Amino acid sequence: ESNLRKAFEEAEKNAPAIIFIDELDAIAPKREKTHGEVERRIVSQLLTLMDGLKQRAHVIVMAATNRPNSIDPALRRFGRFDREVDIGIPDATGRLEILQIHTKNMKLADDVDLEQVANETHGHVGADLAA
């Protein structure tokens, strides 16, 4: 817990900041999935820190999760995570755009048709087109 309490501390004395809590469902799972006691201390240490924002320097806090079902439902009230944005997998014309970003540095020969590679690779996400 003392790592969370000193994580929001620096963001309060360091100008308009943005805090990013990655893999939220690893530290704030569903209440019925919490069996022990130290994993009910982390969640309630996170909840009391969100409500303590006294119109601060506009410390925006964003979190990333895989499935909005698994997040503890207490993190949906007002004053907490309320605005939700959906980042879906790229479509057939999206995947052509990821290719032209990563291959920008490389020196392609004049025989590669990236459109052909774009429309064939259904099932890939942004990270697989970087490998």
Binding residues are 66, 102
Whole-angstrom Cα distance, residue 34 to residue 38?
9
Q: Is residue 78 a contact point for ligand ADP (CB under 6 A)?
A: yes
Q: Is residue 62 a contact point for ligand ADP (CB under 6 A)?
A: no
Q: Is residue 50 a contact point for ligand ADP (CB under 6 A)?
A: no
Q: Which of 38, 85, 108, 109 binds its own copies (CB under 8 A)?
A: 38
Which one, of 27, 22, 24, 21, lies nearest residue 39 by Cα?
Answer: 27
Q: Is residue 44 a contact point for its own copies (CB under 8 A)?
A: yes
Q: Is residue 127 a contact point for ligand ADP (CB under 6 A)?
A: yes
Residue-by-residue DSSP string for 30-79 = -GGG--SSTTTHHHHHHHHHHTT--S-S--EEEE--S-TTSS-TTTTSTT
Contacts of 71 by beta carbon, 8 Å cutoff, 6+ apart: 24, 25, 28, 29, 30, 65
Q: Which is nearer to ligand ADP, 37 or 78 (CB)?
A: 78
Q: Which of ligand ADP, its own copies, none does 9 bind, CB closer than 5 to 8 A by kind?
A: none
Interacting residues toward ligand ADP by CB under 6 A: 78, 98, 101, 126-127, 130
